[PDB]
Design a protein around this ligand. Structure first.
Ligand SMILES: O=C(O)/C(=N/O)C(F)(F)F
Ligand SMILES: O=C(O)/C(=N/O)C(F)(F)F
Ligand SMILES: O=C(O)/C(=N/O)C(F)(F)F
Lengths: 343, 342, 343, 341
């Protein structure tokens, strides 16, 4: 009657075992605090800077991740007048059917499934990268893994294939960080407009505590949430596309702001089209477009992606990203448009 | 940095304690054991019969629910040769934003006595099985299945969650067979990926019968199927069934489906479940063996009402359903259409 | 590690409280007896508590045939006594032996503790529901949470009266608690127990969820000394003198419960009624301080060797030897005559 | 009907959170691994050396204890041919009724009862000592603290006040290290014999795992236990008492070995008397007492004690200071020389 397609159960460290091995340093604590503050301001129209969330499609090699972090950390500080730069530290990836689930689920890319090692690796990384003063971002996919990492997160996303999940809007309503919801795979923007409304509200659901115990949590509600236009059946980063979502959100009585995602369905998957989308969004930002509050970009040390018989350094094992040299031109190419939007 | 928006945590009863208060009776386990095997044999093409998942949209009064079961159990016998009738015991009922469900606000006032809700919902589930009528629920979250899924013989995944990885991960390790609702928007590529996906072994994090996190390694679920339920327009046609039949095979999957006479297929009006029913029996009697099931929002009294004064007995507090006499006709219609085939 | 051979799962205390909840009546029993005993220890009543029953429960069938017989006398002597059946599920050995029904219910070294706790609590509930309070010994530190709400009086073993953690446990026990003198007949130890248990403590124990935590107790004031013999018996009136004024030197209620079994019987089950005579003589003589007594009683008298391994007889204790029923009615009758004779 | 007297409940970290934050180094694991084996070899009679457990009554300051530890590690390495020296690292102290409970309980010494710091201080201190080659020894009073601390322990005692308990002889029967049971608060050796025998059996009982969940546990049983002579209202360290414990151990069919506390009741409550006992046991050991296999000295940087604040002076029972401690460990290494010939 029970547990008959359940093969094994294996012990899983409680969040406090990670929270006490890898406590957040004074520096760390202050990166996330400030970074969360900064993005709040950008969302309440009290800042005109651009939230840019840029980085690999998915972490899988902490060494490569650190070269990228300290490279981008320089541009966080050179463009800190037009850009609020945040690194794309994605430990979990939702695969269309099957495939590698991210670092935390399978950190030795071998179906070992050393998920305890996973979070150890993940948390130490998230930790280190926050020390340097760079802020981190991630997709929130699992219902349990947030408790181990979220205190180091400064901006999260709910996957497209999860923007309708009640359980996922429930989670968004309690996270301490801002959150972005992606429009639906077909480009439906209301299922996301709906999640913003839910997320902004209090909920009361079942979940796991830092001690690894089932419990009932009540959430205050999170009003720092926005849409992420990722296009769908056809790219939708246009200035008039933006104007639809803009109107739409006014109809729903939510603030008219948007994060454009340059990749996936706005790039026809062609990794290099992030430059095209990039060149189109910058025109909108120069033209005076006040409502483009942020940007998401897929970006690694080296352009392209590889299958999973050895590992090319610095290159994605999942979605395909623009290389670093392109990144530089892209980020400076934003700061300039944000310059052209006020001076 | 920690827990700035979460501001209160309350104690929750572990699965192990609800299975101890309310243990499966030899009868209840018997009904679940046979009912699943019944549906498995159907789903491997080994049985003309039609699985009918029918019952209220949501349960809110255990009393009206035991009455429904005794009635529906009666018909589950009568037509046992043609229909495999499985009652539908749904608690939580997704909505963008009153009622969270029976488990979640069992007292219908935002007291959120999940613990009462859970004791109640399992006890009702228990009794319906001990009487011998299988139940079929809907798995939304990841903690709640650990308290109930032993008394369920079939399950569905909400329309707004068929795309989610976490819910396909959950179907990975269900002992009951699973149905996936196609997309809100009538698409079915998502339903296909979920079947494939839930049919793959998985390893994820989940709560145990004792209320601790752990790692699970599931086996993959082989008894899954799409669930047609409309989109822009309804899609209960046979034009439609022909596409899904095709693509399903193009997907290298068993060209079988289950049609939901409700939701986007009823174009909302609850009585239109009868219209859809009429159309299906044409096919089943026509000779369409790849319609292996149907799903009806059926209560004791037709229509619905709104939470406020007391409530009409036997009339849903959520979606409007056909009442009991529409329920008798519809079941008899289906079972007639069944043994046309011959 | 090196010496932990196996680790099986244990049903949490919440699970038994949920499968065997106090009926409204049983709640009443547990609660009236608990206030009664408090009123004895304050002098505002003058009946004699009487914890009397088997040495160890091992047949839930005989323990109910017993409880109905003992309950039948409980109601009759209502006004003299305050009978509390002896439902000890834990027993300690000088060295190695069978530890009680909870720790080995099928006395076949199966150690089916989960069955043990189910059987123990179900029996415990049957008895409080038919009006008969239960008394027990608190040996283990985790079992209490599975049973404490169905016990109206509790003892701390002669061999654990010094143990800091058994004092801590009584400091937060909700029923009232009796401490035995040292196995060598020392009072200092038991006085200290009362005093330690009289004050609040902060320590680790396990909540009703099977979870370790820090608990702050309040302190238990309904604590008294149990006299149980030593090298030679302390049921005297000479000793009752010393114990009374030693207790007044500590500055504590000058009262004492007297055991009749164990060292005061000199491991001689029948000599239990020789002690009765002496105490009813003190009690019928105007000794007000004898506020309780305890007596090892079963259906048939004597005992049998589980360590045999023939088949077992019905209603005979498998550990310490007890009187049989006929003596117990007679013993309970003289106690009631003594208490009335006392006024 | 319940919790009428439970004033409150705060969360306690699981043993695993601490095993993760202060994992044992390769070195610490080795100090432990080796020290245990040493004490096994002594116990089973295959090494004529003498286990010396020595150190403060209670760690209250960790800095003083780290200084003490270096001083004693020098001595341990210098006498390793006659002596196995492990430090007395006693966190949980058992008071006669109500008083300061020790560093794991109320670390800051003011009734905060910050048990989560305590545990944290107590494990880093133990790890630091073990990492630096010096084995450690402590009291096992609680039923839960062992799970955060056990793995950095080479030897433990069961308190004088808790030798008879089923719940403590159960614990002993699963500890990965040797154990010594003290006699009872009057000189009784019967309790200690029974304890060693019980602690030698396997047991099944309820405990908390490394994760903080109650669960069922079967022990294998612990052969590495022995009696700890500590005295009554009259000290029982003189050869006469030693020969009584000897035959008694034979009657109960146990190896006839012993460890002699120099303190508590063989000190008759004055610390400097610990030196006297030493001379006597040193006589016995050099006479050719193979029965005596270890001792226990309460020793600190500053002799004497204070109440509640001096550095390295004990703040519970009085101990000898470092000049007397150097003297004493040497007297012992010499009787261990005499004894071998
Ligand atoms: O599912 C998602 O949210 C995605 N994550 O990176 C996207 F953009 F491909 F759709
Ligand atoms: O199974 C259900 O009741 C559904 N839940 O959301 C639907 F709409 F998909 F059909
Ligand atoms: O150990 C005990 O507390 C006893 N319990 O009943 C005694 F006195 F016989 F030894």
């Amino acid at each position: 009657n029970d547990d008959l397609r359940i093969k094994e159960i294996k012990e899983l460290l409680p969040p406090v075992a990670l929270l006490e091995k890898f406590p957040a340093t004074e520096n760390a604590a202050n990166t996330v605090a400030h970074a969360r503050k900064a993005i709040h301001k950008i969302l309440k129209g009290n800042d005109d800077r651009l939230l840019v969330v840029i980085g690999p499609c998915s972490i899988h090699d902490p060494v490569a991740a650190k070269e990228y972090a300290t490279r981008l950390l320089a541009l966080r500080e050179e463009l800190k007048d037009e850009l609020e730069i945040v690194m794309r530290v994605y430990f979990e990836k939702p695969r269309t059917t099957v495939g590698w689930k991210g670092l935390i689920n399978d950190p030795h890319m071998d179906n070992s499934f050393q998920i305890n090692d996973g979070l150890r690796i993940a948390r130490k990384l998230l930790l280190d990268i926050n020390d340097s003063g760079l802020p981190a971002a991630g997709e929130f996919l699992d219902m349990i893994t947030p408790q181990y990492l979220a205190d180091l997160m400064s901006w999260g996303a709910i996957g497209a294939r999860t923007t309708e999940s009640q359980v996922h809007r429930e989670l968004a309503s309690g996270l301490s960080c801002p959150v972005g919801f992606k429009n639906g795979t077909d480009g439906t923007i209301k299922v996301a407009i709906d999640a913003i409304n839910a997320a902004g509200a209090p909920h009361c659901f079942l979940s796991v505590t830092k001690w690894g115990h089932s419990a009932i949590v009540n959430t205050s509600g999170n009003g720092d949430c926005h849409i992420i236009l990722r296009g769908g059946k056809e790219p939708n980063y246009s200035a008039k596309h933006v104007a639809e979502v803009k109107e739409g959100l006014n109809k729903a009585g939510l603030p008219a702001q948007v994060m454009i995602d340059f990749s996936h369905a706005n790039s026809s998957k062609q990794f290099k089209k992030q430059m095209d989308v990039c060149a189109d969004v910058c025109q909108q930002i120069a033209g005076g477009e006040k409502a483009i509050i942020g940007v998401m970009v897929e970006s690694h040390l080296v352009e392209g992606n590889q299958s999973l018989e050895p590992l090319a350094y610095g290159k994605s094992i999942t979605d395909a990203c623009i290389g670093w040299e392109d990144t530089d031109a892209l980020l400076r190419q934003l700061a300039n448009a944000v310059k052209a939007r006020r001076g």
